[PDB]
Amino acid sequence: SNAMSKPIVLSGVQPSGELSIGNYLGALRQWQQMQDDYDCQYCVVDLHAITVRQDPQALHEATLDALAICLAVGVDPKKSTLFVQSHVPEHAQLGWVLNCYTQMGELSRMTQFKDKSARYANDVNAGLFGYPVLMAADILLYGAHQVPVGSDQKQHLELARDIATRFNNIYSPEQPIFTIPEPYIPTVNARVMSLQDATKKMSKSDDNRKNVITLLEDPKSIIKKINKAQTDAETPPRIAYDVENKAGIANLMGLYSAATGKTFAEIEAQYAGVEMYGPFKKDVGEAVVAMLEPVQAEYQRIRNDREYLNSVMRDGAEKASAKALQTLKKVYAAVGFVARP
Amino acid sequence: SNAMSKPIVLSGVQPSGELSIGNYLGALRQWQQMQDDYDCQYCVVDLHAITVRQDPQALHEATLDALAICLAVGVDPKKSTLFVQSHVPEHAQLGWVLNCYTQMGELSRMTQFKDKSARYANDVNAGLFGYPVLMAADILLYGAHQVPVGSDQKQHLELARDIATRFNNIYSPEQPIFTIPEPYIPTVNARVMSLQDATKKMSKSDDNRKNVITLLEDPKSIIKKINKAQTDAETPPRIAYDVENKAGIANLMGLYSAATGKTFAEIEAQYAGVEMYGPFKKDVGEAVVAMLEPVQAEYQRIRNDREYLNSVMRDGAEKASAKALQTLKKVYAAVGFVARP
């Protein structure tokens, strides 16, 4: 009654890299609907970005890029809580407290830290080590019931659960202070594969950019990449859906289906008797451009309306802090701090 | 012109344990004067207290105890910046950022962490590991030129210097953002020794309480402890100052001198020809009670005036945040964050 009857979801949005068409089809395309079915928070995680050395100007602009992509796919500041992490002071504050309820061993065993320790040698910074604790704060501040996490963030989510449980057991065993978060289950299981290796999931961090279409990719680059996509060895060519034997075509059919709304049964019929993949790949690229272009256009407009973006940031930070401060006050009272008068 | 012409000093005040008469004579007795000669901040470090498991109610009350002891020795909220750490949100915020410029190796080699790791086994928490970074934030927020540090905090102060230098070299090599802090040099080198082992400095954390007089110790306990203090083996007894050969008497003479203003030359003359230590120890205990009692009385009054304490906390947090936020904004801009609009 009413937001109180929907689950609370918190999503972390990175201000770095470029989102892929897999991220779009697997997640962002569904955000406008999720905003109606869940009480959603979208946090642009700039405090986590600086765990690796960032060019300052690039980070600044990437933050605005992330905010604008959220708006472009239909995140509404009035219907969701959309904000930049560093704008909401409660995040770092709860993070410090939660450090005191996190075991060193729990952080040292994190696979993401162990990788970066190996890459950076003695330079490895304490932020990279500690960011799972800050992630836990990010989630727990909002009492999120559900959190979307990639494969590489699952261990981190488990630690958040462990920290919340530990704290609740100490301070509030009968009326818990923290909600124990669970993974969010996406409503579309998109299967977007690397364009030149259809056996491998499309990855936004792939060094091989021939495998990847990004959400803000130039339409001409999208067309070229799709025209060079893996098909299959079937002779004569046959456009039919089959992941095991026709993986490349299956990936193209999945893209065409997403872009046009056509079912695999309609696509098979459309190309019945066509013994060539070239025209089909042209059709797919054009369809993918037509799907993304409207998002790109909305993005490019929103992105250069700084007065609007500032309004969004201001209103989101206020809305987020109002919620987060309630949690922070309860945590501070529980551990024994004197409340600020 | 005018506060801008005095050095900035930040002192950390623990909300745990009990301050000793050595802490009083070595440090706190001089705070009223320091407040005039330096631009002083006194931070009650409750965020650092929770790096070890605290009873919540005990921590709450210990915070108020610490605040009241500062006021009782003459820290004036109008002349100094006196506040509780957790009341000023900028501390945890800068702490997170500074984690990202601190090497894991720098924290792992800290002697204080290595001790606690050995004591707590797998329980050792990430707060105990990371608190040098938060200490650095506590200092750097105020642009402190000088920081009083005990032997056990010197390594931590060096890390603050290292972090400030590293950050300045990256972001501001010509116009530094951070002031590089140095140790504060106390104006009185008090030599307050353990009462039953005059060869060892009096320690507030001594398990042997017979060695320690605390600032808020009951006068009757002070009298008993001083009457059982170490003297020396000289026969006939002779009250004369000599640290190497008459350490126990030297310690008692130092206490009597502090308490009465009498020089060692006056004390020697006062007891000329007196071949007994008993009357002298009675005189010392009475003098020490008379010195501390007025502080105790002011403390006990201030401590139970919650409206006043709340005023002090409110005004101090406002004053501290106004300074700290200026530093935080500069740091956030430098690393590349979008400023909250």
Curated annotation (Swiss-Prot), chains A, B:
Keyword match Cytoplasm: yes
Motif placement: 'KMSKS' region: 201-205
Catalytic activity reported: tRNA(Trp) + L-tryptophan + ATP = L-tryptophyl-tRNA(Trp) + AMP + diphosphate + H(+)
Major site of localization recorded for this protein: cytoplasm
SUPFAM superfamilies, per the entry: Nucleotidylyl transferase
General function of this protein: Catalyzes the attachment of tryptophan to tRNA(Trp).
Enzyme nomenclature, EC number: 6.1.1.2
Organism expressing this protein natively: Vibrio cholerae serotype O1 (strain ATCC 39315 / El Tor Inaba N16961)
TM helices/strands, residue ranges: none
InterPro entries given in the database record: aa-tRNA-synth_Ic, Rossmann-like_a/b/a_fold, Trp-tRNA-ligase, Trp-tRNA-ligase_bac-type, Trp-tRNA_synthetase
Binding site for L-tryptophan: D138
PANTHER family found in the cross-reference section: TRYPTOPHAN--TRNA LIGASE, MITOCHONDRIAL
GO MF annotation terms: ATP binding; tryptophan-tRNA ligase activity
Protein name: Tryptophan--tRNA ligase
Residues spanned by motif 'HIGH' region: 15-23
Alphabetical list of NCBIfam families matching this protein: trpS
Subunit structure: Homodimer.
Subcellular location: Cytoplasm
Residues binding ATP: Q14, P15, S16, G22, N23, G150, S151, D152, V192, K201, M202, S203, K204, S205
Record-stated family: Belongs to the class-I aminoacyl-tRNA synthetase family.
GO terms classed as biological process: tryptophanyl-tRNA aminoacylation
